Amino acid sequence: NSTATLCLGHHAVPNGTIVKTITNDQIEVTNATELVQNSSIGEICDSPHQILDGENCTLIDALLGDPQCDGFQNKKWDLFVERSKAYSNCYPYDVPDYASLRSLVASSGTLEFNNESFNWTGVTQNGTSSACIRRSNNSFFSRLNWLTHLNFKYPALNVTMPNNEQFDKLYIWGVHHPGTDKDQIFLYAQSSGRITVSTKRSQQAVIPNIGSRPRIRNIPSRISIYWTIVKPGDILLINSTGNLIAPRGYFKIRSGKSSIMRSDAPIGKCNSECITPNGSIPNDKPFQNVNRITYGACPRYVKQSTLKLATGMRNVPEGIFGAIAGFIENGWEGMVDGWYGFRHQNSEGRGQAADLKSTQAAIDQINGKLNRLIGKTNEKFHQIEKEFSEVEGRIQDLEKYVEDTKIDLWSYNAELLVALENQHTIDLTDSEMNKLFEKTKKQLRENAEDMGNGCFKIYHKCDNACIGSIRNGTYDHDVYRDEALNNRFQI
Amino acid sequence: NSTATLCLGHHAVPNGTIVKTITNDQIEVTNATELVQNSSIGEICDSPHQILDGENCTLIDALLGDPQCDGFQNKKWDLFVERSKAYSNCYPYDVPDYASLRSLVASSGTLEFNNESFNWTGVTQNGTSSACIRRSNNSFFSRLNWLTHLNFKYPALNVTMPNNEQFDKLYIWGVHHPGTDKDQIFLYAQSSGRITVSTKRSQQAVIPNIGSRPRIRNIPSRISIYWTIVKPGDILLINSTGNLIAPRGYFKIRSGKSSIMRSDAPIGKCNSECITPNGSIPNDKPFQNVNRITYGACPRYVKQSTLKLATGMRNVPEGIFGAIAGFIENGWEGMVDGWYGFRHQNSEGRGQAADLKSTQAAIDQINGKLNRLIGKTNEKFHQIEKEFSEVEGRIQDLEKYVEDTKIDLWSYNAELLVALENQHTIDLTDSEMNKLFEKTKKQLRENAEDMGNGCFKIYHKCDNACIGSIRNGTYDHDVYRDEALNNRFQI
Amino acid sequence: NSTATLCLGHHAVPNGTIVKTITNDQIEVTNATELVQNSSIGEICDSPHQILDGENCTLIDALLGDPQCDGFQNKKWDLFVERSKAYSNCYPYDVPDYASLRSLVASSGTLEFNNESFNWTGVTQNGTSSACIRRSNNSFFSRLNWLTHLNFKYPALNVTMPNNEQFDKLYIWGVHHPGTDKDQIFLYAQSSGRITVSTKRSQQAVIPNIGSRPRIRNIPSRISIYWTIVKPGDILLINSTGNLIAPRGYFKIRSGKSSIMRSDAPIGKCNSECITPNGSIPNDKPFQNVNRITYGACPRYVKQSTLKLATGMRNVPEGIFGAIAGFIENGWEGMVDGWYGFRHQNSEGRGQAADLKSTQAAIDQINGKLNRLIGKTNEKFHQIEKEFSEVEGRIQDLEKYVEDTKIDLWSYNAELLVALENQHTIDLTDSEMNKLFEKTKKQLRENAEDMGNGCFKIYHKCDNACIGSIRNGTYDHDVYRDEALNNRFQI
Ligand SMILES: *[C@@H]1O[C@H](CO)[C@@H](O[C@@H]2O[C@H](CO)[C@@H](O)[C@H](O)[C@H]2NC(C)=O)[C@H](O)[C@H]1NC(C)=O
Ligand SMILES: *[C@@H]1O[C@H](CO)[C@@H](O[C@@H]2O[C@H](CO)[C@@H](O)[C@H](O)[C@H]2NC(C)=O)[C@H](O)[C@H]1NC(C)=O
Ligand SMILES: *[C@@H]1O[C@H](CO)[C@@H](O[C@@H]2O[C@H](CO)[C@@H](O)[C@H](O)[C@H]2NC(C)=O)[C@H](O)[C@H]1NC(C)=O
Ligand SMILES: *[C@@H]1O[C@H](CO)[C@@H](O)[C@H](O)[C@H]1NC(C)=O
Ligand SMILES: *[C@@H]1O[C@H](CO)[C@@H](O)[C@H](O)[C@H]1NC(C)=O
Ligand SMILES: *[C@@H]1O[C@H](CO)[C@@H](O)[C@H](O)[C@H]1NC(C)=O
Ligand SMILES: *[C@@H]1O[C@H](CO)[C@@H](O)[C@H](O)[C@H]1NC(C)=O
Ligand SMILES: *[C@@H]1O[C@H](CO)[C@@H](O)[C@H](O)[C@H]1NC(C)=O
Ligand SMILES: *[C@@H]1O[C@H](CO)[C@@H](O)[C@H](O)[C@H]1NC(C)=O
Ligand SMILES: *[C@@H]1O[C@H](CO)[C@@H](O)[C@H](O)[C@H]1NC(C)=O
Ligand SMILES: *[C@@H]1O[C@H](CO)[C@@H](O)[C@H](O)[C@H]1NC(C)=O
Ligand SMILES: *[C@@H]1O[C@H](CO)[C@@H](O)[C@H](O)[C@H]1NC(C)=O
Ligand SMILES: *[C@@H]1O[C@H](CO)[C@@H](O)[C@H](O)[C@H]1NC(C)=O
Ligand SMILES: *[C@@H]1O[C@H](CO)[C@@H](O)[C@H](O)[C@H]1NC(C)=O
Ligand SMILES: *[C@@H]1O[C@H](CO)[C@@H](O)[C@H](O)[C@H]1NC(C)=O
Ligand SMILES: *[C@@H]1O[C@H](CO)[C@@H](O)[C@H](O)[C@H]1NC(C)=O
Ligand SMILES: *[C@@H]1O[C@H](CO)[C@@H](O)[C@H](O)[C@H]1NC(C)=O
Ligand SMILES: *[C@@H]1O[C@H](CO)[C@@H](O)[C@H](O)[C@H]1NC(C)=O
Ligand SMILES: *[C@@H]1O[C@H](CO)[C@@H](O)[C@H](O)[C@H]1NC(C)=O
Ligand SMILES: *[C@@H]1O[C@H](CO)[C@@H](O)[C@H](O)[C@H]1NC(C)=O
Ligand SMILES: *[C@@H]1O[C@H](CO)[C@@H](O)[C@H](O)[C@H]1NC(C)=O
Ligand SMILES: *[C@@H]1O[C@H](CO)[C@@H](O)[C@H](O)[C@H]1NC(C)=O
Ligand SMILES: *[C@@H]1O[C@H](CO)[C@@H](O)[C@H](O)[C@H]1NC(C)=O
Ligand SMILES: *[C@@H]1O[C@H](CO)[C@@H](O)[C@H](O)[C@H]1NC(C)=O
């Protein structure tokens, strides 16, 4: 009562959160934040990326000109979205290395088509069919020109088209495989058939194959689709003695941030940077567990479903410096205006006051970590395919291995980051507590002794103004030293 | 002698181990554990994975039905093991994209075969040869049907088989390349030859090639092998005007954890989760240096041959807090019952006692690290090939680049992990020493002074019970304070 | 004046450097070092790697024997350098899977050619042309043998060459595609044409294709190039009924550290381990931002343009322990002979002296980090291509994805490394300051008090020798204790 008590302490909360550290699988901190995005809003937002809903059409079909896809002529996109309900409703076709054509078009991001006046003298043009109905009338692929005999003849062709432009030209064309020699003759006069299209730096030579294939919408014949790119100064040369499905011009081909994604998520009227096939996801967090397939500024895909980053000190209700959860027995739930503070007992009563500077010092360091982690995601656009409908073997093994390797390495980085950061956050908060204790100890000089539990026995009368002077660093120890020394060193 | 001495200290061992840290390439700790598995027991354990020793046969040969491999019919496996002594002893064949077929079968993990009744009217069946001897009699691939002319004719074929099942069908078939036009005629009547097998979504068209190839076991002709997968609702259509080696049915194809590995390690009767081509390896450690090729729950392959994780404090025989290898000059080899402790000298003699709580605190943190690192390996099954017998160029460059990239990134993670963990382990053990010293200092209050080497000069008579009271935290400093103050502050 | 003052402190500089840490985006340290190499000297040094400047020739052209490339016969290289000004000046040719052939030759690293005596009876040899002029005379590819009819006939060929050597043989050959049936007849008698070259383990069957292609230097015909590798015990068998461009022997094929790089950097007379297409770069730093394409012992490519590693303490002009930028208000710019030191004031004046041991302790730890980071780069030779002139789709997507994945993971490692190291460097330097303060405090025992700003009020007369005794650890506190106690505990 000719003394006072001044206790240093830290807050605590009733609702702590369990986090992982380097040394401990489960340690409770006052607060934490989730680093793995685990949910989607279920819609693909139409902003800020130019979305193109394929709806009933695949990219290839819109490219070829299946009547169902006429509304897609000359469209551009940042992301083309293919629905699984999609289906082709024209002449049956295949594409050798389909995936590569789909990819290069997707990545180009435009269906811009220019018509070119090819010299088809000696042949019938605009071939038409019952399996490809447009406006209730028999039609064909809008971008392709089906050549047939004219007056029962079909001469050799040797037509050229030069690229005298400042850009690349993308040609799409194909070969017809009739189901019967009857049809071969009926359509092309001759029995055989041969197609050869060349440039200065390439040649693709195709030999038709008459034969039966299982009928698709009642058609047993097939078209095989091919592409060739012609650069400025180069020339397209197309030779044919049969079966040639002719281009009507070229597609502009670009390089940019365009791509394509398989999804059945509906398009919504909203704005979100990151798109997955499950829908758009917020990109505030650095990691996500929604889908390895993403487009835009996205958190990185990891295996974990949750990773909590501590944003507060260890919670001790009721560190390397040994203050928090050490010589200070527990935290103060009644301290809600700061993280660290003072409790005192003197002649005028018992009080509690937060220390702002130590509180702010810890908060700033924690916000420093958050600043490095939150809202810093990176943009990816066209990548590789990561889900597959058919067995292909080698190349598919490689593609899957690459993505699995990547994911394990990112999942490792995420796990280690959080464990290291959390160990460090618990240590820095213990350190700020220790610094406050140490600073106060030095202030008191010979006027007080450390009771070993964060409390100082102050060996002189110390009213509220006196305690206040200690808390704001204006305590003059010389004023009380004589009083304190006599109380300390007596019998 | 009207005083006592109490010294704080830590153990040390005669046999220290050198580890790496962030700041030091070679620092000695009391104990460490090896994180890189560097040895195999030389055998592939037959448990707990279903092992299939190919012995004399490659997977493809067991698939085709080389008489040598009859015992393999309809077998399943988790891991198929190909021996290098393996060799084919039937009709000479090649497979275009051999590696992809080998892969998809390996990954499927079953040789389950169902026979199908194909309508081969107009042809001779069960063709047979001298290069493929079964039961001492001329035979052929058990799963293939060699068609030849019947009565010197060989009509067009147009046979269908539909998939009306709930699963995929895998068809294996092939084309015969006779060495002479003589043989072409002798076998198939006609001079030419043509094979076309189709589904609703595919077509593979093959044209035979008569010609001589260097004789393998005296045969200059060859079979080329092909495969096609037919899904539910789809149909196989096979057209042929020559040279068709016919399937006798389909293989069930599955998806699972199956794979294949090249090794000459004998199969042992033992249980081990992780298999390498050198033999099975323990998977307690997180890393391994045995082989980049693995199967099962395996440590990750890294380049280092050794990485030691400190599991004890710095060894100081004869840190950031400056206690261990700092103001405490050395450790105590005579302390074998704890890591940290007390030595005293008083009127009753000199003694040493371990402090359990500080010892346990360091041990728990170290076990926390071990828990994150030991026995936590991850399962990989079918991957990519990582050793190659032939030059292939581009794709092989990519496969090698991917694995080399992966390995360097894991080797980096391993190196950094151990350096960080070791720096931290040395620091946390120094910290526990410091906390014990600090706690003891506070206990003694004004009754003792810090001599600067971890020892306290206690300024009062302190018998064994008194020293004991300090060690178990029951020391009442008020009892001795008058005695201590008078001894401290005299002349 | 019956007292002295002894202040503990650390240096500071006028020219600090901003670095990143875990908790702070911008913190000033006394010194830092750059970890990202951002510049090239613009030349490719001809040492210590054997450089081969392709100059006007591509690797393939030197391989085939384009007259322009005669000087390259049988050359070896560590790194072949292709110039963009390069051009072919012989018979127009293409290579299917050009990139794979270029790669395997590059990786082999030799143009060693042995001539082989093939039995070409029944044919004319040494075919020659106007598009391939050597010594002012019509010539051909030096390594190829253009076969034509002899006396208007051209029999079937069935020539063998066996590998009875201890090494692999690499055969290069090709097929001629005449522009007219006229030329086909003129050159090869027959109308058709067929080439089939085989080994015991392979067969490549080619069918020529008569037709027009856009003329390259006035030639509309083309040669297609192929390769086959024959191992010891195996045999080359080449059948042909037309159009065969024959090999004149084989290339030795090796395995080693050879590769190829596209660059327009001039070759310089200098020595540098690391080569990029921009020129050689120093490899002292662990990372580089110059080019993802490298050869030799190179720093790793990362995205950042700069990463500064702190090599000094926090700069405080005018940490977890709270000494530097904590209870010590600022550093001393006037201390240029050490990092930590003593300032005193006594009867004889005011002085400053560096403490070497604490200075050396921090410097050693920092050099420990530098030793792990500086001059430890790793050797890579032949890798994958990373820049592309044509759209290819799938495989190119995979190659680009792999490199982009790798780069992001290394850029992550670099960013985290520096942030962790810097946080730790700032903390260890604060720790050394704290240890020095703590050690000094203990030395002084009851003779001094901590004023709270790193300074001790020493309560006795302490001349220069006395202060000196404190700095070199020979201070005997017992000598002054009576004097000090009386001054401390008075009124
Ligand atoms: C080969 O066989 C298939 C199936 O038996 C034939 O295709 C069928 O043709 C009939 C008309 O005769 C159609 O009604 C069926 O719908 C077809 N089935 C399928 C699965 O496409 C085919 O015509 C035969 N080939 C030849 C040349 O006759
Ligand atoms: C092409 O040449 C090869 C090798 O000279 C011939 O193959 C040989 O045929 C004889 C029989 O006449 C066998 O005894 C040899 O063992 C064969 N050698 C090899 C390497 O296979 C082949 O017959 C020739 N082609 C033709 C059509 O006669
Ligand atoms: C196919 O057309 C091309 C271009 O019209 C022809 O190639 C030209 O041939 C003339 C000679 O008649 C040359 O002067 C031109 O330089 C050639 N142009 C190109 C682009 O190569 C080609 O001859 C035609 N095919 C046939 C069989 O006549
Ligand atoms: C703890 O409770 C408070 C008050 O209800 C709340 O604001 C805070 O978010 C809670 N913390 C956690 C981690 O849920
Ligand atoms: C928990 O931490 C996060 C991140 O700093 C913050 O947004 C949230 O407000 C905190 N919760 C409380 C109750 O302070
Ligand atoms: C898509 O096709 C379905 C039939 O499969 C049809 O009902 C629907 O109206 C089509 N949608 C559009 C936009 O054409
Ligand atoms: C074919 O149809 C297109 C438009 O559908 C037309 O521009 C073109 O002139 C037609 N060709 C012929 C030969 O009539
Ligand atoms: C393929 O089979 C059908 C039925 O005979 C028919 O297209 C034809 O006969 C066969 N192909 C050839 C090239 O003869
Ligand atoms: C996203 O879709 C995948 C299937 O493509 C599914 O496995 C995953 O659970 C989905 N995620 C969410 C959050 O719905
Ligand atoms: C320090 O506390 C005393 C006591 O209440 C007060 O009078 C004084 O204004 C404070 N000083 C500062 C700088 O706030
Ligand atoms: C040190 O020696 C003891 C006793 O022989 C032994 O148990 C221990 O394993 C040794 N430590 C090392 C790292 O070898
Ligand atoms: C060394 O550490 C390992 C891991 O904690 C432990 O298994 C072993 O018993 C330790 N050795 C000694 C001698 O304590
Ligand atoms: C495997 O083949 C060798 C001959 O190459 C033979 O000696 C051995 O008995 C065969 N093993 C089996 C299991 O058939
Ligand atoms: C061919 O042999 C199999 C069994 O080896 C038999 O089931 C089949 O009936 C035979 N075919 C003919 C046409 O005899
Ligand atoms: C290939 O060479 C041999 C020997 O003459 C024979 O098979 C045939 O004559 C050649 N091929 C063709 C298609 O003529
Ligand atoms: C495992 O096999 C590889 C060769 O495939 C060899 O380089 C390596 O040394 C072997 N490891 C052991 C531990 O035997
Ligand atoms: C503390 O030590 C004293 C002295 O030996 C002993 O009597 C007492 O039982 C100890 N207290 C505890 C709680 O063990
Ligand atoms: C600071 O200045 C000194 C003297 O000019 C110089 O040697 C040193 O390199 C400078 N530090 C930096 C980081 O530029
Ligand atoms: C800065 O640090 C680097 C690396 O230790 C060193 O080379 C350089 O001399 C230092 N600069 C000064 C001025 O000490
Ligand atoms: C390379 O070709 C150019 C013409 O394109 C020529 O001027 C130059 O002399 C050539 N250089 C060599 C080394 O042949
Ligand atoms: C073809 O030319 C080469 C050298 O240019 C010569 O060795 C060879 O004998 C010639 N061939 C003939 C058939 O003259
Ligand atoms: C290709 O076109 C040109 C011009 O007629 C010529 O080479 C030939 O007629 C065509 N090809 C065939 C195989 O007829
Ligand atoms: C190196 O070359 C690349 C283009 O290949 C260029 O983007 C980069 O800026 C160059 N780097 C330097 C340091 O010149
Ligand atoms: C310590 O300092 C004193 C005072 O100058 C000096 O006489 C003595 O030689 C020093 N001791 C050592 C070991 O350098």
Short mmCIF file of C-alpha atoms in Angstrom, two decimals, chain B residues 22 35 102 120 140 145-146 169 174 214 273 317 365 372 385 457:
data_model
loop_
_atom_site.label_atom_id
_atom_site.label_comp_id
_atom_site.label_asym_id
_atom_site.label_seq_id
_atom_site.Cartn_x
_atom_site.Cartn_y
_atom_site.Cartn_z
CA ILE B 22 21.25 -20.72 -43.67
CA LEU B 35 16.22 -37.21 -44.87
CA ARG B 102 2.11 -50.15 -74.03
CA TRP B 120 -16.05 -64.15 -91.50
CA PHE B 140 -0.22 -67.83 -84.16
CA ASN B 145 -7.16 -64.27 -86.34
CA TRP B 146 -5.11 -64.63 -89.52
CA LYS B 169 -14.03 -52.15 -75.75
CA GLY B 174 -3.12 -55.69 -87.65
CA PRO B 214 15.95 -57.99 -92.93
CA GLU B 273 4.84 -49.52 -50.33
CA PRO B 317 32.09 -29.63 -26.11
CA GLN B 365 9.09 -28.60 -31.07
CA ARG B 372 5.67 -32.83 -40.74
CA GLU B 385 8.88 -42.76 -69.20
CA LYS B 457 26.22 -15.98 -7.23
#
